[PDB]
């Protein structure tokens, strides 16, 4: 029933990004800047919705204690700029009924109602300690990495892992990006 924001994201900001590790959902933030899970390990080029695009720059986010945050910020060598969604990034997440918007592998155009979310903090994510993790009790799937955790007019984070009973997103913060 409440899909307008997710559909808007899918139409202007959410992509399928292919690396040598496979397909991931990716989120364009502003300009030519997008995010993908760090374990996607993007190379010098990626596929964006199937089209080969050179990676102008990339870097992995870590916190001030050098702990993995599991987000990699990519700058794409493409002319088109993303619709600016920096103003929707929200840390206002405790107890909100959130949605995952997925566009990769066998879950394209996919909207998941993951329920209330909370900050879990530090998690052992596939043997890498990872901070600023947001948790939901929902069954997630191998093909959904990169899914955008959001609510109406709010973007909370990016899905990066799970175990079939609980899923985890890397928190997105406005401070990760050029101020808008």
């Amino acid at each position, epitope marked *: *029933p409440n*899909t307008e924001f997710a*559909l808007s994201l899918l139409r202007k900001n959410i992509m399928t990004i292919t690396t040598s590790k496979g397909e991931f959902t990716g989120l364009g933030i502003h300009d030519r800047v997008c995010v993908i899970p760090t374990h996607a390990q993007p190379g010098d080029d990626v596929l964006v919705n199937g089209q080969k695009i050179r990676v102008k720059d990339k870097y992995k986010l870590v916190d001030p204690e050098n702990i993995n945050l599991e987000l990699t910020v990519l700058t794409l060598d493409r002319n088109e700029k993303f619709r600016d969604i920096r103003g929707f990034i929200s840390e206002d997440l405790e107890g909100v009924d959130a949605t995952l918007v997925v566009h990769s592998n*066998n*879950f*394209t*155009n*996919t*909207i*998941l*109602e993951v329920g209330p979310v909370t900050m879990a903090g530090l998690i052992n994510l596939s043997s890498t300690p990872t901070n600023r993790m947001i948790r939901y009790d*929902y*069954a997630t*799937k*191998t*093909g959904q990495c990169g899914g955008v955790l959001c609510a109406t007019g709010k973007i909370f984070g990016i899905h990066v892992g799970g175990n*079939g*009973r609980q899923g985890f997103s890397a928190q997105l913060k406005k401070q990760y990006f050029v101020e808008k």
Partner: antibody
Amino acid sequence: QVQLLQSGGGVVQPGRSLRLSCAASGFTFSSYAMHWVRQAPGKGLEWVAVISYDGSNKYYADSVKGRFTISRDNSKNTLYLQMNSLRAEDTAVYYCARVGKGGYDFWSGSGYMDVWGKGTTVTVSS
Amino acid sequence: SYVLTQPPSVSVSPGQTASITCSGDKLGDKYACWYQQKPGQSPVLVIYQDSKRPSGIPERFSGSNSGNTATLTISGTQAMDEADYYCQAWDSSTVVFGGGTKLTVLG
């Protein structure tokens, strides 16, 4: 309050057409993909067809593709399955069902089915 | 054609745990849901998105999905649970029902 009221069906001669219909009430019909699912006598549930929330995407099981058409009227909260070129193997109870909002693909209409109609018996006299 | 397999029948006495499975290639990478169907009635959703219970569904029903197999467990089976149970898988390209399992509750 949430209701899928089905109508149509009966005995039909092979090669002919029959329209099944469903009137939806108690929810925002235009926001949901809808499926038809059928069950032959003493057999299991079999997916038949899907139409996406706005009617723009339609898919059919191999068993009925090229014969049946699915359609919807989001102003009259109605769903239709037009069964054409009927064959003996189409004999079944036909249910329509709403795709639940807990997790779904809004383009293909794939998902799980959280509300079912009572079912309409179609018997092909062949 | 993607095929989902279920055992034809399960039987338990009241209070026992009943376990009904459905299997298919990489089912654990798709979503599994479960429907209960009593004679002469429409299916009723009892588990969705692998493990979630709709409101009104008794807590004795639980679900899991991993590898190639989804499992519906009834912990403390009741006489009124006698029914056919159908698993259904979905992903973007998939809506498929398993063949069904007849659950008899006896003695």
